[PDB]
């Protein structure tokens, strides 16, 4: 019965390909040609937070757009006040090999994770003043690559065991687990309505998930290498994917295909982080060539260079109000641009 | 500037504590464990005492070591191997009882992140290798080995095969043989680490 199953799979793939090809009546490049270009976007460094001593792997903003949390490899998660460039907290970590961080939307908890296969939840509003480890989630076989906060009780994580899981920070059990990727998952983006999320794995494929039913909805392809970043459009109807093939690609949830390829023949270093602007007009992508490019999301054109890092940029993120852009590189310095 | 002064004082205090912790941590010596499954990594990490990453620390002659074992990661190595760019050396262990490890050594030796870090080679199960040599020829693994069927020459050929994978002139590959019943592993690692430390410090100053 293996032959029948293989034939059915091939037929289904052909049907999906034909259906997706029929709906491509026009492209974004043929539609947004008559809009005036954004011109030059010359941003200058506003602050330079020099606290760490080793590589920086992650950086996340709070909901108030003033506080940021950096999880460096020195085994320290320092919470940052951007306006005054002050250190507000210093949380030592049990495992120094950390490669993700998350700031709760309420602002009471901070998540962390890495090669310990375990997601750690720290409580920033303890009665005793200091910060304590509220919970230590276990259940992943491979390394935890990302973690995002749905709310104060549920946290969704992506790990290198080819599976993503939904957690309950109260009982510390996997309420729902997501399967289907054939390889390591190294990115994750929760939707603005916190009902959907998408993951980009190392098998060169992006998938759309439903948090409630726990079933895969759509599969996006088009990359020739591992996907290192993912991020939603502000409207939640589209998302951007950066890969190790030096290309950023834009997909549509409803149209279920690709829309634009953000590539330059001169660029060869991979992308480590993709993030948008508040209006969804710019797409700041972090390359390994020690600089971050600002792409025009509607015309596939460069609009400026955020040069200034001595090493590869490992994390990028914009504030909720869109008043600042953050870049964190291996040079142990985090920068605020405006 | 009413209670922002106290915030500034707190930030300065915790910055000072960060600096002190960094200086305290910078003294330690960091090694990295690598090898095939059941190659003998567990034996030589347990003989020195004390599913994620397993870290083992011990002090030997005024040096604090930190052996980082990453054998539990059943995923792609290329997505986390850059975490150890600053390790002083790589301890690579080969089980002489058994070609499935030569490819791994070749991959790890020419890696862009490890173009300057030295590699320390330990070979285990000497008695087992001798028994197998008596029982079976050593040319089954290496068909091109035209030489005597003895332990002494087989070990030399194995060392040559593993050492020929180096391409960078600015690194060294120390070698050693083990019999699973000796305690000289600590002294060997100490001597190799002192040599590597001398080399790195001389190269930093430009005198190398």
């Amino acid at each position, epitope marked *: 019965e293996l032959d029948q199953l293989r034939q059915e799979a091939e037929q289904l793939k052909n049907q999906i390909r034909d259906a997706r090809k029929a709906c491509a009546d026009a492209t974004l490049s043929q539609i947004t040609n008559n809009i005036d270009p954004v011109g030059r976007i010359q941003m200058r460094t506003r602050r330079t937070l020099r606290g760490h001593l080793a590589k920086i792997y992650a950086m996340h903003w709070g909901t108030d757009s*003033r*506080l940021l949390v950096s999880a460096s490899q020195d085994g320290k998660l320092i919470i940052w*006040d951007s306006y*005054t460039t*002050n250190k*507000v*907290h210093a949380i030592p970590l049990r495992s120094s090999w950390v490669m993700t961080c998350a700031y709760a939307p309420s602002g009471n908890y901070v998540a962390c994770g890495g090669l310990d296969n375990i997601c750690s939840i720290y409580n920033l509003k303890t*009665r*005793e*003043g*200091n910060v304590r480890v509220s919970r230590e989630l276990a259940g992943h076989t491979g390394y935890l690559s990302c973690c995002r906060f749905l709310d104060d009780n549920q946290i969704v994580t992506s790990s290198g065991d080819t599976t993503c899981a939904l957690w309950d920070i109260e009982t510390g059990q996997q309420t729902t687990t997501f399967t289907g990727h054939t390889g390591d998952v190294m990115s994750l983006s929760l939707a603005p309505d916190t009902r959907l999320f998408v993951s980009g794995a190392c098998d060169a494929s992006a998938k759309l998930w439903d948090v409630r039913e726990g079933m895969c909805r759509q599969t996006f392809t088009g990359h020739e290498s591992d996907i290192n970043a993912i991020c939603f459009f502000p409207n939640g109807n589209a998302f951007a994917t950066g890969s190790d093939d030096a290309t950023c690609r834009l997909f549509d949830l409803r149209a279920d295909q690709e829309l634009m390829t953000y590539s330059h023949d001169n660029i060869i270093c991979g992308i480590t982080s993709v993030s948008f602007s508040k209006s969804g007009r710019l797409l700041l992508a972090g390359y390994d060539d020690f600089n971050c490019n600002v792409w025009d999301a509607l015309k596939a054109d460069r609009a400026g260079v955020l040069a200034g890092h001595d090493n590869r940029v490992s994390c990028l993120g914009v504030t909720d109000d869109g008043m600042a852009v953050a870049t964190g590189s291996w040079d142990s310095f985090l920068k605020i641009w405006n | *500037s*009413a*209670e*922002e*002064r*106290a*915030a500034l*004082e*707190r930030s300065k*205090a915790i910055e000072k504590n960060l600096k002190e912790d960094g200086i305290s941590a910078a003294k330690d010596v960091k090694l990295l464990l690598l090898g095939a499954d059941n190659s003998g990594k567990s034996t030589i990490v347990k003989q020195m005492k004390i599913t994620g990453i397993v870290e083992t620390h011990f002090t030997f002659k005024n040096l604090h070591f930190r052996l980082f074992d990453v054998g539990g990661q059943r995923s792609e190595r290329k997505k986390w191997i850059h975490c150890f760019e600053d390790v002083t050396a790589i301890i690579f262990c080969v089980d002489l009882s058994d070609h499935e490890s030569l490819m791994l050594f070749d991959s790890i030796c020419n890696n862009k992140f490890f173009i300057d870090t030295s590699i320390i080679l330990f070979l285990n199960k000497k008695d087992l290798f001798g028994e197998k040599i008596k029982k079976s020829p050593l040319t089954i693994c290496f068909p091109e080995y035209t030489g005597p069927n003895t332990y002494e020459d087989a070990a030399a050929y194995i060392q040559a095969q593993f050492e020929s994978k180096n391409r960078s002139p600015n690194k060294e590959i120390y070698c050693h043989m083990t019999c699973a019943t000796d305690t000289n592993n600590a002294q060997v690692i100490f001597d190799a680490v002192t040599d590597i430390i001398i080399a790195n410090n001389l190269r930093g100053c430009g005198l190398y």
Partner: single-chain antibody
Framework: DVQLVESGGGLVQPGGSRKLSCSAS????????MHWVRQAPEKGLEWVAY????????YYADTVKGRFTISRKNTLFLQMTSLRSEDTAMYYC??????????????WGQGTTLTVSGSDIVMTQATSSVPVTPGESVSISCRSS???????????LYWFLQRPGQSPQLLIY???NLASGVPDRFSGSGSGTAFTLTISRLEAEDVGVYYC?????????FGAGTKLELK
């Protein structure tokens, strides 16, 4: 739980020397700024001394400076020299943390009793006493001699509640925010110079005396106090 028990009072001859010590347990005392607040047998609260975390900055009141010294094992010491007749009060222990979004003056100790045989922002609580019935909304007013809206946009008015026979509790900090555990019925407002704390759906446990404090610059001068007596 957090606990601040302290002792060192009694009856002292004038010119004698006493030592009050504050025992702390249940919280990271090494990272909190401890103050000293006293209450005369009839008058209101008056700030005494403050010692920063790490013994960096120490402040003393104008009527305290020179004679009294404070020092810090989880114990806070306050050396007391040249006791005068005006020093009779009940000395309290208060902790405080200062960072972005912090809640200063959150916890207050049980206090100890001691008996002895020009740029200050003066604050006035115009109403000495306010009679109010259960279930009816009231209002507590305060003022200041200088603007308390700093350039950074944070008003520094702290409201305190002193229940009858109990240590004061922090109810509203930064003139708009509500402290931890405080019921939602309380709400405070104001602008620039005049401030108001609105109590809606009065209950039996809210009866007491309410206080006004400033934090724009040392010394921290309190108000006279408004007595929200029953009926």
């Amino acid at each position: 739980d957090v606990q601040l028990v302290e002792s060192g009072g009694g009856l002292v001859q004038p010119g004698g020397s006493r030592k009050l010590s504050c025992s702390a347990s249940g919280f990271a005392f090494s990272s909190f700024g401890m103050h000293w607040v006293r209450q005369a047998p009839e008058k209101g609260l008056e700030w005494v001394a403050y010692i920063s975390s790490g013994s960096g900055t120490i402040y003393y009141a104008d009527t305290v400076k020179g004679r009294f010294t404070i020092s810090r094992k989880n114990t806070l010491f306050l050396q007391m020299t040249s006791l005068r007749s005006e020093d009779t009060a009940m000395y309290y222990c208060v902790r405080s943390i200062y960072y972005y979004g912090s809640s200063p003056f959150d916890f207050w100790g049980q206090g100890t009793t001691l008996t002895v045989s020009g740029s200050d922002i003066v604050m006035t609580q115009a109403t000495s006493s306010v009679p109010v019935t259960p279930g009816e909304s009231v209002s507590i007013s305060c003022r200041s001699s200088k603007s308390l809206l700093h350039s950074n946009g944070n008003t520094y008015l702290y409201w305190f509640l002193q229940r009858p026979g109990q240590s004061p509790q922090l109810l509203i900090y930064r003139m708009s925010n509500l402290a931890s555990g405080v019921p939602d019925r309380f709400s405070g407002s104001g602008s620039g110079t005049a401030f108001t704390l609105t109590i809606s759906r009065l209950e039996a446990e809210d009866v007491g005396v309410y206080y006004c404090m400033q934090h724009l610059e040392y010394p921290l001068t309190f108000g006279a106090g408004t007595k929200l007596e029953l009926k």
